[PDB]
Amino acid sequence: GIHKQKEKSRLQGGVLVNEILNHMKRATQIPSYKKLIMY
Numbered sequence: 001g002i003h004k005q006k007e008k009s010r011l012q013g014g015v016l017v018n019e020i021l022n023h024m025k026r027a028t029q030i031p032s033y034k035k036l037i038m039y
Helices: 013-029 033-037
Strands: none
Touching: none
8 A cells, every 4th residue: 555545635635645755755865874774
């Protein structure tokens, strides 16, 4: 699964997805965290 109650939303929900992308992308822009999980 990749959605909680997105179904409830008709079109507006779409915008939500877009926003999410930003956050995710930013993550790849800062792989520094890798060091943490790593040794």
